[PDB]
Amino acid sequence: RVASGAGLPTSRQTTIMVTKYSEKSPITIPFELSAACLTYLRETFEGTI
Amino acid sequence: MDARAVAKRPRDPADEDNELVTALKAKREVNTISVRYLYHADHQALTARFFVPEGLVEFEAQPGALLIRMETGCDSPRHLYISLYLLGIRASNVSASTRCLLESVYTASAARAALQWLDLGPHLLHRRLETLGCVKTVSLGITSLLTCVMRGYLYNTLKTEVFALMIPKDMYLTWEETRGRLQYVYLIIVYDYDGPETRPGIYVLTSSIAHWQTLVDVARGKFARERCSFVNRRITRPRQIPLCTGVIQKLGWCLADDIHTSFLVHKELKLSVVRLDNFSVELGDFREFV
Amino acid sequence: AMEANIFCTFDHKLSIADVGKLTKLVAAVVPIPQRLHLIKHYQLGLHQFVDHTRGYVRLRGLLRNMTLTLMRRVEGNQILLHVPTHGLLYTVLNTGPVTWEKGDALCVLPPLFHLLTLGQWELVLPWIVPMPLALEINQRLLIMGLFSLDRSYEEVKAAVQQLQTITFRDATFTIPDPVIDQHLLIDMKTACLSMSMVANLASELTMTYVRKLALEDSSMLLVKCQELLMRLDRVSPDDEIARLSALFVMLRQLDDLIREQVVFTVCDVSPDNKSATCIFKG
Structure with missing residues (x-):
C-alpha cells in the first residue's frame, strides 16, 4: 500500500489468495x-543359418 | 492462583511496554517508525470521524460546537450534519438582528438546503434531528472532515488544550441566580403552537438539577404560555393530532466556575457566545414533556 | 490482564464445520438470564424463552432485564462471552434485518422474521434495530392487535395489509400477524385491553376530577382543559378508590410498550455493512 495526504481516503489491510490446479x-x-x-x-527352433 | 499474584501490585498499563515494543524486542529489529510512546493511549474521549460538505463547516474552524445530525426522507442523503449555530434560523428564540447576521454567513448551498429540508415533512424537529456531541478538529479541504466526541472531555491530543463548547447567547438559559457547585446542561426544544409560526424555541438550559421529574416539573412552569398555546391549538383546530409540546435531553455537565462569555470570530463577523470550558459529553435521548 | 468473560460451555458433540459456522458470529449480541460465570447453551439466547401460546410482548417484557453480552472468542468446547459495561465501546454485528447508518440510536427487539440447530435447540439471536423503526413497529403491532375482533370485514383485511408492511431506507419489510386463527393471543389481548381500559376510564373520571379541581384552579390552563373535555362530552367512594387503583394497575401492566431505553449508539459502521462500532449505554 502507499500513504496519501489528509482529506483523501486510504487503502486498508488487503490480502489475496489464489490457487492453481x-x-x-x-x-x-x-x-x-x-x-x-x-x-x-x-x-x-532348429539350428539353420 | 497463588498468593503472590494477588499480592503483587497491579501492572502499570502505561509504563509496561507497548505491543509493538514487545513484538520488536523479542525479535530485535529496527524500523524507521518511532514507536516507544503511542499517542492517544491514555485517552477516554471516544471520537468518531465525520465527513461534511463545505456549506456546513463555517463557524466550525474554531473548535467546540454541537454537531447535531438530521435525516431527510429523500434516499440519496440519509443524514446530514447541522451545526447548532446553523439551527438559529429555525430557532424562534433567536433575535432578528442575530438571525440577519448569521444568515449572512451560511450563504452556501448546503445550509439553505438543510433549512428547506427542516420545514417540509409532517413531523416536528425532535423526530427529525439527532444529537451527537461536540466537534474538536477540522481538516478543511473542500469536503472537510470532522471528529466529534460522543463521550468524555474535549481535549487536543497530548492533553495540552482543553477545548471549549460555545453556544450562541440567544439559546442560553439559566433559571437561578444562585448557581450550584456542579451543574448539568440540557437541550430544550419547545414548540409554540401557532399556525404559521410553528418554528420551535431552542434553548440550552444550564441548571443544578440532575433529576428528571423535578426538572420537567419546573419546566412546565416556565413554558406555560406555550403549554396553553398547545391546548389552544388543540381546541381551536380539532381532528389534528400534535404531540411533544416540549422535548429535553441531557447534553452534559460543567463545573459552573468557568461558564463565561466570549465571542466567535468568523470572517470578521463577531458573535457573542456563552462559553463552557471544561465540558463533558454524556448523551441522553430525546425525552418529551407536556 | 483478563476481563469479565463468562465461560459458556456446550453439552453436545460438534463437527469442525459447526465451529466454522459458529465462528462467524463473533461480534453479536446475546441475551443472558443471569450475570453468572459458567453457563450451558440452554440458557443462551431466546429459544429458552419462546412459548407457543405467548408472543412478542411477553418476550419483550423478559427482554428489558437481560445482560446483553457479546461473544469475544470461540474455542475448543467453550465460548467466551463478554459482558459490556456502560461507557466503553464495542463492535456489534449487523445481524438485524434492517441496516444502520452513522449516528443512530439502537435498541433490542425479538426476531419477528426468521444460526446453530440441534435436536431440541436452535440458537436464536435478537434483532438490533434503530429507534424510529422500533417505535414504528410498536405502533404497528398495537394497532394490528386492535383490529383483531373486527377481522371479518373486507376492508379491514386491506387495512391490515397496508399496516403489515413498514418502510425504512430501502427496506420494504413486513411483519407477521399477531392474531392467529381469528383470535388474539393472551399477550396482545392484555396489551390492547390495558389501552382500552385506560382510555375508557380517562373518558369517564377526568371530568369529575377536573370540575372538583376547578375551584382551586390557579392557572390559565386547567380551564381550557375542562372546556375541551366539556366539548368532547357532547356512588360510594370505594368504587372511586377501586377505579383509580384499576387505572394505575392497567398503567403498570403497560410499560413494556410505552418506551424503549437506548442501548447502543453507532459511531462508525464497517464498509459493506456487516458490523459497526457502538458505545454501550444503559
Missing part, C-alpha cells in the same frame, strides 16, 4: 507386433 493429459501410442515376430522371438 493440475490438468491430466495422458498419451498412448500403442505399437503392434506382427505375430510372426512374436512367435519367432520367445521360442527357439
Whole structure:
C-alpha cells in the first residue's frame, strides 16, 4: 500500500489468495507386433543359418 | 492462583511496554517508525470521524460546537450534519438582528438546503434531528472532515488544550441566580403552537438539577404560555393530532466556575457566545414533556 | 490482564464445520438470564424463552432485564462471552434485518422474521434495530392487535395489509400477524385491553376530577382543559378508590410498550455493512 495526504481516503489491510490446479493429459501410442515376430522371438527352433 | 499474584501490585498499563515494543524486542529489529510512546493511549474521549460538505463547516474552524445530525426522507442523503449555530434560523428564540447576521454567513448551498429540508415533512424537529456531541478538529479541504466526541472531555491530543463548547447567547438559559457547585446542561426544544409560526424555541438550559421529574416539573412552569398555546391549538383546530409540546435531553455537565462569555470570530463577523470550558459529553435521548 | 468473560460451555458433540459456522458470529449480541460465570447453551439466547401460546410482548417484557453480552472468542468446547459495561465501546454485528447508518440510536427487539440447530435447540439471536423503526413497529403491532375482533370485514383485511408492511431506507419489510386463527393471543389481548381500559376510564373520571379541581384552579390552563373535555362530552367512594387503583394497575401492566431505553449508539459502521462500532449505554 502507499500513504496519501489528509482529506483523501486510504487503502486498508488487503490480502489475496489464489490457487492453481493440475490438468491430466495422458498419451498412448500403442505399437503392434506382427505375430510372426512374436512367435519367432520367445521360442527357439532348429539350428539353420 | 497463588498468593503472590494477588499480592503483587497491579501492572502499570502505561509504563509496561507497548505491543509493538514487545513484538520488536523479542525479535530485535529496527524500523524507521518511532514507536516507544503511542499517542492517544491514555485517552477516554471516544471520537468518531465525520465527513461534511463545505456549506456546513463555517463557524466550525474554531473548535467546540454541537454537531447535531438530521435525516431527510429523500434516499440519496440519509443524514446530514447541522451545526447548532446553523439551527438559529429555525430557532424562534433567536433575535432578528442575530438571525440577519448569521444568515449572512451560511450563504452556501448546503445550509439553505438543510433549512428547506427542516420545514417540509409532517413531523416536528425532535423526530427529525439527532444529537451527537461536540466537534474538536477540522481538516478543511473542500469536503472537510470532522471528529466529534460522543463521550468524555474535549481535549487536543497530548492533553495540552482543553477545548471549549460555545453556544450562541440567544439559546442560553439559566433559571437561578444562585448557581450550584456542579451543574448539568440540557437541550430544550419547545414548540409554540401557532399556525404559521410553528418554528420551535431552542434553548440550552444550564441548571443544578440532575433529576428528571423535578426538572420537567419546573419546566412546565416556565413554558406555560406555550403549554396553553398547545391546548389552544388543540381546541381551536380539532381532528389534528400534535404531540411533544416540549422535548429535553441531557447534553452534559460543567463545573459552573468557568461558564463565561466570549465571542466567535468568523470572517470578521463577531458573535457573542456563552462559553463552557471544561465540558463533558454524556448523551441522553430525546425525552418529551407536556 | 483478563476481563469479565463468562465461560459458556456446550453439552453436545460438534463437527469442525459447526465451529466454522459458529465462528462467524463473533461480534453479536446475546441475551443472558443471569450475570453468572459458567453457563450451558440452554440458557443462551431466546429459544429458552419462546412459548407457543405467548408472543412478542411477553418476550419483550423478559427482554428489558437481560445482560446483553457479546461473544469475544470461540474455542475448543467453550465460548467466551463478554459482558459490556456502560461507557466503553464495542463492535456489534449487523445481524438485524434492517441496516444502520452513522449516528443512530439502537435498541433490542425479538426476531419477528426468521444460526446453530440441534435436536431440541436452535440458537436464536435478537434483532438490533434503530429507534424510529422500533417505535414504528410498536405502533404497528398495537394497532394490528386492535383490529383483531373486527377481522371479518373486507376492508379491514386491506387495512391490515397496508399496516403489515413498514418502510425504512430501502427496506420494504413486513411483519407477521399477531392474531392467529381469528383470535388474539393472551399477550396482545392484555396489551390492547390495558389501552382500552385506560382510555375508557380517562373518558369517564377526568371530568369529575377536573370540575372538583376547578375551584382551586390557579392557572390559565386547567380551564381550557375542562372546556375541551366539556366539548368532547357532547356512588360510594370505594368504587372511586377501586377505579383509580384499576387505572394505575392497567398503567403498570403497560410499560413494556410505552418506551424503549437506548442501548447502543453507532459511531462508525464497517464498509459493506456487516458490523459497526457502538458505545454501550444503559
